[PDB]
Amino acid sequence: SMSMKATRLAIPDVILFEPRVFGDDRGFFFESYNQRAFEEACGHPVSFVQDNHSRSARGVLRGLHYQIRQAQGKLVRATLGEVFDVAVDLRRGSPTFGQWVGERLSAENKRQMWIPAGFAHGFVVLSEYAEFLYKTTDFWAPEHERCIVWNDPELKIDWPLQDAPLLSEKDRQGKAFADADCFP
Amino acid sequence: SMSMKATRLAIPDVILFEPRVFGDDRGFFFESYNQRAFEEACGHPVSFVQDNHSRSARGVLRGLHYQIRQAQGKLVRATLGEVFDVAVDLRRGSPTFGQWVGERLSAENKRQMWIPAGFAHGFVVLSEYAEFLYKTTDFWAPEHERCIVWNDPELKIDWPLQDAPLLSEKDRQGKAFADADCFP
Numbered sequence A, B: 001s002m003s004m005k006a007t008r009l010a011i012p013d014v015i016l017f018e019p020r021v022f023g024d025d026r027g028f029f030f031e032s033y034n035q036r037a038f039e040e041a042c043g044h045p046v047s048f049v050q051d052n053h054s055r056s057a058r059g060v061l062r063g064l065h066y067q068i069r070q071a072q073g074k075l076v077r078a079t080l081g082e083v084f085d086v087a088v089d090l091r092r093g094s095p096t097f098g099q100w101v102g103e104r105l106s107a108e109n110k111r112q113m114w115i116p117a118g119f120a121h122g123f124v125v126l127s128e129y130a131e132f133l134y135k136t137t138d139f140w141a142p143e144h145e146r147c148i149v150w151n152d153p154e155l156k157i158d159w160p161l162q163d164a165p166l167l168s169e170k171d172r173q174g175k176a177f178a179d180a181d182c183f184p
C-alpha cells in the first residue's frame, strides 16, 4: 500500500526515483527497474542497451562524463556504500544550460537518478568503498567520450570532500566548461 | 587478450556468462550487460523489461519458480556473497525435459546464467548474506506464477547445503514435478 516514488528535480528533465521495498523473514525484495512504470514517469519511451558496474574507494571521483555523439541517457544507483551524484545540463538552448543538481545515493536509501542525453555526469565516494550501477540508452563509443574537469570554476560544484580527490588521468585532464563541446 | 566469455551448458539453451573486468588503483569497472554481445552469444534478439533485486541470509532457498503464461527468460547474477543457482527444463517436448544444471555464482567470480522462458529457476544462499540481481524478458504476473518443491524426488537436485534450507510458506507448499503445470 506504498509504491514507487518519482520526483522531478530543479532541472525538470532529471528525475529522482525511489523503489518500493518489501522486507520479510528472508531479507528484502524490490524492482530496481520496470519499463512501464519508468516510461509513465518520464513521459516517453526509453530503451536501455548496456548495464555498467564499478567499485571505488573513499574519495574517488569519476567524471564529469558525456558522449557528444551516440549520447547516453543514464539511470544510476548505488548498491554498496554512499556517493554524491551530480548532473550538469550541457544543452546550449536550455534555460538551465550550465546549471547542476546533486543528490546522495546509497545502498541504504536505494535512490536512483535518471539523467537524460544532453547532460554530463559524475560522482564522488563518501564511504570506505562504493559500488555504482547504471543503465545506458546507447553503447560505449570511446571516440565520442568527452570530459569536463570536476572543479571547474564556472560550474562551481560543491563536492563533499575532505582532502584531494582520487582521479584517473583522463579525469584529472578534463577540459574547462568554457572550452567544452556542448549539445544544441 | 581478454574478453567476455560465454559457455553453453549440458542443457544447451542455458548459457554461463563471465564479464571482462578492468582493474586500476581506484577499484574496477565492467559491463554487466551488453545487448549486442548477449544477442550474438545466444543467437537471437532479446528484450528485458524488468530488473529485480533481493537480499537473503545464509541457508535461504528461493524456488523453483516459473510463470506458465507471460513466461520470463532470466539473466541472473550475484553482487554480494555466493549462491548455488539451478535451471530446470520444464518443456514437456524437449529432449532434456526434467533435467537440471547448476553453477556457483558470486560477487567475486562475476558469473551469470541465462535461463530462457520454459525453465524453472531456484537458488540457495551459501554465504552470510547474498544479494541477487536478475533481468526478465516479461513482467511479473502473480496469477501465472507456479512453484515446484525444492526437494522433488524425480528432479533429484543436489543442493550443496549442510543443514535444512529456510523457505517461505509458498515454497514449502510447492507442487511435485509429477503434478505440476509444465510447458509443452
Ligand SMILES: Cc1cn([C@H]2C[C@H](O)[C@@H](COP(=O)(O)OP(=O)(O)O)O2)c(=O)[nH]c1=O
Pocket (backbone or CB within 6 Å): A052, A140, A168, A169, A170, B022, B024, B029, B030, B031
Ligand atoms: C565506460 C566503459 C569503459 N570500458 C572500459 C575502458 C577502460 O579500460 C575501463 C575503465 O574505463 P575508464 O574509466 O574510461 O578508464 P581509463 O581512465 O583507464 O580510460 O573500462 C568498457 O569496456 N565499457 C564501457 O562502457
Ligand SMILES: Cc1cn([C@H]2C[C@H](O)[C@@H](COP(=O)(O)OP(=O)(O)O)O2)c(=O)[nH]c1=O
Pocket (backbone or CB within 6 Å): A022, A024, A029, A031, B052, B140, B168, B170
Ligand atoms: C517477483 C516479484 C515480486 N513482487 C512482490 C510480491 C510480494 O509482495 C513481494 C515478495 O515476492 P514473493 O516472494 O513472490 O511473495 P511472498 O513473500 O509472499 O512469497 O514482492 C513484485 O512486486 N514484483 C516482482 O517481480
